[PDB]
Every structure is written in structure tokens, then in C-alpha cells.
Amino acid sequence: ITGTSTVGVGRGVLGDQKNINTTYSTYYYLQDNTRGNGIFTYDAKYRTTLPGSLWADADNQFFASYDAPAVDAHYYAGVTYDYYKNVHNRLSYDGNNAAIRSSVHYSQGYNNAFWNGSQMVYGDGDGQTFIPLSGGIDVVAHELTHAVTDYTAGLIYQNESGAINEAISDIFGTLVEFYANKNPDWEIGEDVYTPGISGDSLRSMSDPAKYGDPDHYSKRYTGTQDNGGVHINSGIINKAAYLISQGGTHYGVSVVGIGRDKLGKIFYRALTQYLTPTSNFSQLRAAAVQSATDLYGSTSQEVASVKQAFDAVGVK
Numbered sequence: 001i002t003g004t005s006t007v008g009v010g011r012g013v014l015g016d017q018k019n020i021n022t023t024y025s026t027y028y029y030l031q032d033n034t035r036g037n038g039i040f041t042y043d044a045k046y047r048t049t050l051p052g053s054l055w056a057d058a059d060n061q062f063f064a065s066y067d068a069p070a071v072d073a074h075y076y077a078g079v080t081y082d083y084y085k086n087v088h089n090r091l092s093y094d095g096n097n098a099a100i101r102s103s104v105h106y107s108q109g110y111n112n113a114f115w116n117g118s119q120m121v122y123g124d125g126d127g128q129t130f131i132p133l134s135g136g137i138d139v140v141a142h143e144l145t146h147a148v149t150d151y152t153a154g155l156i157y158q159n160e161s162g163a164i165n166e167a168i169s170d171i172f173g174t175l176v177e178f179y180a181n182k183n184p185d186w187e188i189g190e191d192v193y194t195p196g197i198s199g200d201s202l203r204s205m206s207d208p209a210k211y212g213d214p215d216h217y218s219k220r221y222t223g224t225q226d227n228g229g230v231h232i233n234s235g236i237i238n239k240a241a242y243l244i245s246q247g248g249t250h251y252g253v254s255v256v257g258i259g260r261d262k263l264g265k266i267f268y269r270a271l272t273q274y275l276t277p278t279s280n281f282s283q284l285r286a287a288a289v290q291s292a293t294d295l296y297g298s299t300s301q302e303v304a305s306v307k308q309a310f311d312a313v314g315v316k
């Protein structure tokens with residue numbers, strides 16, 4: 001809508017207070033005019049019709065329990081936007097400042113979040129497996145990164161291409177979490193997963209096997225579940241990314257870590273320049289190697305660590 005840009009205040013899913021960019025026109029709306037063509041957050045009102053209604057509030061204060069997932073969806077979409085802009089010189093997911101839209105309160109007891117081709121969507125969870133999923137910064141960035149991938153490499157959502165797609169979303173979700181510096185880690189979804197269990201998460205990048213996911217190519221899932229294991233075989237690539245950044249010795253192969261900024265630059269370049277819709281793990285290795293070469297030179301430590309990391313997870 002047309003209106004006046006202002007700043008509201010509210011509480012997120014985890015009870016933290018934060019300011020949010022809003023728009024005033026009779027009501028205060030969750031519409032952030034300060035980033036690209038705008039960031040818009042909607043209420044799906046426990047239904048499955050999308051997007052639902054643009055979030056409207058009477059007093060620009062968002063402290064109701066019902067407000068919390070909208071606050072976080074709105075705020076963390078903003079943070080993710082800032083990450084891609086400030087760190088990668090990318091303007092929104094399409095690179096031309098496309099409007100970012102999110103709906104919360106999707107369905108009832110819905111233990112999921114997704115990117116539907118046009119917008120982000122967050123369930124409230126059932127209160128046992130998940131609390132509202134927009135409460136996790138890595139979750140929000142993971143979803144927005146699907147949009148980025150769709151508009152760039154266009155990796156199809158099956159088999160190894162699909163698993164790369166997932167890993168890219170896990171990689172950048174994590175890098176956004178570190179960028180915001182709010183209890184950052186190499187785990188996925190820990191902030192909103194299983195409120196009755198501390199210390200766990202949906203996935204681990206540092207040790208995927210912790211939650212049943214493969215950390216080596218030899219252990220890859222070859223069946224037909226999960227579109228050929230896109231959420232499973234992503235562990236192989238996640239582990240590789242972790243190793244590139246942090247270093248370590250994995251199945252006897254040692255890797256010198258080059259840090260997360262360089263990890264981000266190498267993978268962002270691979271994603272936006274060399275990956276294709278049907279790229280497999282081997283092609284990803286080649287793309288990451290070419291990216292690191294482009295950025296740091298053929299004989300660099302960066303290139304050598306990329307190679308070591310893929311070697312470590314058995315990807316040639």
C-alpha cells in the first residue's frame with residue numbers, strides 16, 4: 001500500500017524485543033519500504049489460502065502472542081536481505097530488488113516452512129516438534145535462499161541437484177545466522193525445533209551423522225524417498241562447506257579452514273556463475289574449485305582447501 005514509513009516495536013517467537021520497519025495508512029502494516037521493492041508480511045489466519053491479508057495493527061506495537069511469528073518473519077527477511085546486499089552485492093532474491101513476501105500462521109499445527117515459487121510460508125508448528133518456524137533466523141534465510149537458487153542456478157529439486165539446492169539453503173541460512181551474530185552455530189533449526197529438548201536440531205552441518213544424514217559420498221542415499229534424498233544427501237555437501245570454513249580431519253583427510261566469509265564468496269560465486277539446473281556433486285566440486293580459482297588464484301590455499309574438503313567427503 002501507499003503510506004508513511006515508520007518503525008514499530010514488538011516481540012519475536014523467542015520473546016526478544018526488536019524494532020521493525022512498518023507502513024502507516026490508517027493501520028500500521030508489516031510493510032518495510034526501506035529494502036528494495038519492499039518486504040511484506042501477511043496473516044494466513046490458520047488457513048492455507050495464500051498470501052492471506054497484509055498484516056495490519058492498530059498501534060504499531062506487536063507484543064501479542066499472535067504477533068510473534070509475524071514479527072520474526074518480517075525482521076529476519078530484512079536481515080537476510082541485508083546479508084545478500086551488504087555481503088554479496090545482491091539486491092533481493094532476483095537481483096533486481098523483487099518484493100519479499102511472507103505469510104505466517106499457515107494452516108493448523110503445521111510443522112513446516114517453505115518457498116512456494118512466489119513467497120515464503122511459515123507454519124506455527126504443533127508446539128512439540130516445532131514452535132512457529134519464522135522464529136529461526138536460519139529457517140527464514142534457508143527459505144529465502146531457495147528463492148535465490150531458483151533465480152540463479154535453478155537446481156532442480158531432486159537427486160544430487162536437489163541435495164545441492166538444500167545444502168545451499170543450509171549454508172547461507174547459517175551464514176546469515178552468523179551475520180546477525182545471534183547465538184550462531186553450524187546446526188540447522190535449533191531455535192525452533194523441539195521446545196521440550198535442549199541442544200538438538202533438525203540437521204547438523206558440522207556432523208550430519210549426528211541426526212542420521214550422510215557425511216560421505218559412499219553413504220549417500222540412493223532410494224526414492226524425499227525426492228531422492230534432497231534433505232538427506234545435503235549432509236554430504238553441508239559437511240564439505242563446514243570443512244572449507246572451519247577445517248578439520250574427516251575420514252583421515254585433513255582440511256585447512258579458510259573461514260566463513262571466503263566460504264560464502266566461493267559458494268555464492270559457484271551458485272551464481274557455474275551451477276546449472278542439473279548439476280551433480282562432482283560438478284559442484286568443479287564449480288567451487290573454479291570459483292575459488294577466480295577469486296584467489298589456482299595455487300591458493302583457498303583452492304587447496306576446497307579440494308581437500310570435497311576429497312574428505314568422497315566427492316571427486
Ligand SMILES: O=C(O)C[C@H](NC(=O)OCc1ccccc1)C(=O)O
Binds near residue numbers: 113
Ligand atoms: O522441502 C521443502 O521445500 C520444504 C522444507 N521445509 C522445511 O524443512 O521446514 C522446516 C525447516 C526449514 C529450514 C530449516 C529448518 C527447518 C525446505 O525448506 O527444505
Ligand SMILES: [Ca+2]
Binds near residue numbers: 060061
Ligand atoms: Ca498492536
Ligand SMILES: [Ca+2]
Binds near residue numbers: 177182184190191
Ligand atoms: Ca543458533
Ligand SMILES: [Ca+2]
Binds near residue numbers: 177190
Ligand atoms: Ca543454526
Ligand SMILES: [Ca+2]
Binds near residue numbers: 194
Ligand atoms: Ca529443541
Ligand SMILES: [Zn+2]
Binds near residue numbers: 142146166169
Ligand atoms: Zn530447503
